Amino acid sequence: FSAFSTSRWEYGSPRLERYNGLPSLEILGQAAPGKSTGEAMALMEELAGK
Amino acid sequence: QDDISDYVAANMKDPISRTSGVGDVQLFGSQYAMRIWMDPNKLNNFQLTP
Numbered sequence: 001f002s003a004f005s006t007s008r009w010e011y012g013s014p015r016l017e018r019y020n021g022l023p024s025l026e027i028l029g030q031a032a033p034g035k036s037t038g039e040a041m042a043l044m045e046e047l048a049g050k
Numbered sequence: 051q052d053d054i055s056d057y058v059a060a061n062m063k064d065p066i067s068r069t070s071g072v073g074d075v076q077l078f079g080s081q082y083a084m085r086i087w088m089d090p091n092k093l094n095n096f097q098l099t100p
Contacts, residue, residue, distance in 0.1 A: 021064050 055079025 018024055031040035059081035067075045088100060 020068070 056082040
């Protein structure tokens with residue numbers, strides 16, 4: 001095999017995921033104990049705008 | 051028309067097709083493809099066939 005090939009080490013994803021047909025990364029998190037889940041969702045949605 | 055059709059196929063047809071209550075989606079175009087337009091004279095020169 002060394003006659004007709006070369007080898008190298010590179011980084012790759014062991015597990016790829018898609019959401020609604022498009023490549024995606026799932027982020028799991030919780031709201032802070034003082035605040036509600038809706039506020040956390042809205043804040044993280046606003047952060048994604050940046 | 052080809053670029054617009056490819057963009058619609060890649061980013062708009064699939065999400066709409068899975069929208070609730072949408073039964074069938076007919077694309078008025080065509081998605082991109084790798085077109086290999088062969089030349090019979092050049093293929094004959096090199097003793098090659100499709």
